Amino acid sequence: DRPRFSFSIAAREGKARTGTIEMKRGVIRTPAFMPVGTAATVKALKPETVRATGADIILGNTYHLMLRPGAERIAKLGGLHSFMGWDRPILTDSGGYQVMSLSSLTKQSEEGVTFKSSRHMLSPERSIEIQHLLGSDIVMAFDECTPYPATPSRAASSMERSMRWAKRSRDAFDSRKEQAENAALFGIQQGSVFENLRQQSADALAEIGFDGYAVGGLAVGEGQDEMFRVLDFSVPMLPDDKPHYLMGVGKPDDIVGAVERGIDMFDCVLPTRSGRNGQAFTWDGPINIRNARFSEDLKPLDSECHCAVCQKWSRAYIHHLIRAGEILGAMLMTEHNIAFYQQLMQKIRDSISEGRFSQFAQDFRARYFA
Amino acid sequence: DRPRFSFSIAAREGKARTGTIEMKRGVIRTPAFMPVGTAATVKALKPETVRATGADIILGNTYHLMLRPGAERIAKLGGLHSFMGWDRPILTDSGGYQVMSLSSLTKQSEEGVTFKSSRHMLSPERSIEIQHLLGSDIVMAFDECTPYPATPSRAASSMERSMRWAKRSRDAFDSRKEQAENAALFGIQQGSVFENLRQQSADALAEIGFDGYAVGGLAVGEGQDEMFRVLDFSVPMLPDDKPHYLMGVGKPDDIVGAVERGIDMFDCVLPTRSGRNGQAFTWDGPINIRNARFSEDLKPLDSECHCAVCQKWSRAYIHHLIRAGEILGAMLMTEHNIAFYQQLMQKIRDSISEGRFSQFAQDFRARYFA
Ligand SMILES: CO[C@@H]1O[C@H](CNc2nc3cc4c(=O)[nH]c(N)nc4cc3[nH]2)[C@H]2OC(C)(C)O[C@@H]12
Ligand SMILES: CO[C@@H]1O[C@H](CNc2nc3cc4c(=O)[nH]c(N)nc4cc3[nH]2)[C@H]2OC(C)(C)O[C@@H]12
Ligand SMILES: [Cl-]
Ligand SMILES: [Cl-]
Ligand SMILES: [Zn+2]
Ligand SMILES: [Zn+2]
C-alpha cells in the first residue's frame, strides 16, 4: 500500500524536475496541474470527466466550504471525497487568499481572521480543523496572502505573522493523530517581491519542516516578468527534495516558465472560468469561441488535442452553444480546457524525462505566440 | 438495412399498444418518450448521456433553430445530427406551437405566419423545407395549436386552416424526393375539446395519409381530466396501424393515462426544465431537492432508480449543488429525471408486453400519489 507521503524526483533538466508524489489515495505525477473545485465541484464536470482528462488531484477551499455547505456537515456526510465523488487526492487551500481578497469583510488579529457576510472565524487551528473535517489529503498552512504591491515594512510584518501562523498550523496538524498519519501539510512562503523576506520565510518554514512548500503571494497582479524574477530567487530557497507549489498560476506560458524555475504543482481557475466565458486554449494560443468567425468553422477547438470534445464537436457547434447560453457549452469548453492543461503537463513531464524540456519550452512559446 | 419507416405493434392491452418504429437511423421502442432538445441540445446533457438513459429519439424545433443558429447554416454544416452529435432519429416540431404561444409577435394569414422579433416567416412549405435542411427523420406538418379555451366557431376555423396546411405540408414533403425517401411525415389533429371537430380533423388527415398522427392542441392549460376526456374519443379516430403522438405531454401520471388511451409517443420539457429548477421525479412522487430536509440526506434521489446519478451521489450533495447554482446540479438532476422517464416507459412497455399494464398503472398511481 502507498505511504502517507513520498515525493520522488525521477528526472531533472536545469531547475525543472519531474517525478511523483505517492499518497494513500493515489499517485500525483509532477509537474502537476490541479483543477479548481472550490464549491465541492470542478464547475460543469463530473469527477469522472475530471479524471478522464488526466487530473491526479483537485483543489478545494477551506473558506468556501466552511460557508457552504459547512465543514461539520461535510464531515457528518462522510467527508469531501465521498460527498463529491472524487476518491483521489484533494489539496485544500487554507483560506489565506480570502484573508486578502475579502479583507473588507474582515477583522484581523494575531489570533486569526473573522469574516462578516453571519460571522465566521478562521485561525491556524480552525483552518487545520476544517481541513481535517473535509478529509483533505494535502492540508495548507493558514497564512496571509500579502496584498500587492506592498511596502517592505508591511510585507515583512505580514510574512512574520504568516510564519508564526505556520508554526501554529504545524502544531495543530500534528496534535490530531488521524490527520498527521494520513494527510500531508504544506507551508506557504511569503515576502512579496523582496528577496531578503523570501529568504527569511523559506528559512522559517524549513526550520518548522513541512511535506511541501508553496510559493504564496504571487498571481496577485504583479505580471509575468515580475513573477518570474521573484521565482528566480525564491524557489532555490526551498528544500530541493520536497514539492514546490505555485499557488494560483496560471496561463500556459506562466506554467512553462514556472517549471523552468523549479515549480512542481499548480492550480488555476483560468481553464474552467475562462472556458465558461468562451475562451478555448489551443497550441496556437487562446481563441474566443464567441467570435463570429467560428460560426461555420467545422474544425475542432484544437487541431491536435486528444480530448473527447475535439474528437466529436466542431467550433461551430460550441460557438452556437456559448452564444445561446447553453449549459452544454460550458461543459464542453471546460472539458477541453482542462484536458488541454493536462496535455500541457504531460508534454512537460515527458520532455523533462527525455532531457528536451528547454527545446519544448522554446517550441511551445514560438507556436503559442505566433 | 432498416426501412424509411415501419411501425409494428407487438402487443396490446385494452387501448394500449407496445411495439417499434424502424427508421433508417434507428429503432424507436413504443410507447416512447422523447427528450426535448430545442436549441440543438438536450439541456445540460451530452448526447451520449441522453442515449445512456435509454432515449431512442429526441425532439428538435423548427422555430428555434430557424432563428438560431439558422436552418441553412445547419445544412451547410452537415445537418442537425452531425452538428449536435446525435446520430439516431430526431423528430422536429413544425413551429405550430409557437404560432400560438408567440402570437403577439405574429401576423397570421392563410399563407402562413410572420414572426417579428428581425422578421422570420413560416408556412407549410417553409416549415417542411427547414425540417429538410435540418435533416429531420420525423417531420411534423405545419399547423396551428388552437389556443385554449376556444369557442366552437374559432376552434373550427383554426382546425380547418390546419387541415388545409396539412395537405400543403404533405405535398411539399412529397415534392422533395430525398426527404420523401428518407424521412417520415406526421399529421397533427386539431379541434380543441370538441368531438365533432376532432372527428373532422382525423378524417381529413387520414384522407391525406400520413406515417403517424399527433394529437395536437392539448397540454395548453386544460388540465388532466379534460385532456383524458378528449383523448377518450380522439385517439380511436386515428388510424390504428400508425403511431399516435401526444404533443407536449407530460407528467408521469399524464403519460400513464395517455398510454391507457392509445398514445404511443410523448415529449415534454418537464424532466429537463423542472430538473434544473430542483424537482426530481421518484416512484413516490416528485421532490424538491432545494428543501432543507435534504441537506443531510445520504439517500439517492430515488431508492430504486438505476441511473448513474443514483448510483453515486446523495440527495445532500445535489441539494448543495442546486442551492449553490452549480452547473453540475443541473447536469445531475437532468440525467436522473430523463432516466426516470425512460424507466417509466420501459416499465410501461414491459407491462403491456406481459398483459399486466392495467395492474401496473394502478400500482404506479397508488405509490406515486401516496
Ligand atoms: C482567482 O483569482 C485569479 O486566479 C489567480 C489566483 N492567484 C492566487 N494567488 C494566491 C496566493 C495564495 C497565498 O499566498 N496563500 C494562500 N493560502 N492561497 C493563495 C492562493 C492564491 N491564488 C489570480 O491571477 C489573476 C490575477 C490572473 O487572476 C487571479
Ligand atoms: C413548454 O410548455 C409546457 O409544456 C407543455 C407543452 N404543450 C404542448 N402542447 C402542444 C401542442 C402542439 C400542437 O398542437 N401543434 C404543434 N405543432 N406542436 C405542439 C406542441 C405542444 N406542446 C405545456 O404543458 C404545461 C401547460 C404543463 O406547460 C406547457
Ligand atoms: Cl472556476
Ligand atoms: Cl428544457
Ligand atoms: Zn480538446
Ligand atoms: Zn436516478
PDB file of C-alpha atoms and ligand atoms in Angstrom, chain B residues 281 300-302 304-311 332 335-337 339-340 343, ligand 6:
ATOM      1  CA  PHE B 281     -39.048  12.559 -10.034  1.00  0.00           C
ATOM      2  CA  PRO B 300     -30.054   8.784  -3.694  1.00  0.00           C
ATOM      3  CA  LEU B 301     -32.734  10.846  -5.407  1.00  0.00           C
ATOM      4  CA  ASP B 302     -34.823   7.687  -5.840  1.00  0.00           C
ATOM      5  CA  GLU B 304     -34.845   2.121  -6.948  1.00  0.00           C
ATOM      6  CA  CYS B 305     -33.644   4.212  -9.900  1.00  0.00           C
ATOM      7  CA  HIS B 306     -30.844   2.563 -11.874  1.00  0.00           C
ATOM      8  CA  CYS B 307     -29.342   5.777 -13.240  1.00  0.00           C
ATOM      9  CA  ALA B 308     -25.709   6.757 -12.798  1.00  0.00           C
ATOM     10  CA  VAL B 309     -26.681   9.706 -10.593  1.00  0.00           C
ATOM     11  CA  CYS B 310     -28.490   7.484  -8.102  1.00  0.00           C
ATOM     12  CA  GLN B 311     -25.593   5.033  -8.104  1.00  0.00           C
ATOM     13  CA  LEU B 332     -27.206  15.509 -12.340  1.00  0.00           C
ATOM     14  CA  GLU B 335     -29.781  12.979 -16.125  1.00  0.00           C
ATOM     15  CA  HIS B 336     -31.758  11.437 -13.276  1.00  0.00           C
ATOM     16  CA  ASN B 337     -35.098  12.854 -14.439  1.00  0.00           C
ATOM     17  CA  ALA B 339     -33.501   8.325 -16.845  1.00  0.00           C
ATOM     18  CA  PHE B 340     -36.574   8.144 -14.607  1.00  0.00           C
ATOM     19  CA  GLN B 343     -37.505   3.721 -16.873  1.00  0.00           C
TER      20      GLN B 343
HETATM   21 ZN    ZN C   6     -31.668   8.244 -10.723  1.00  0.00          ZN
END
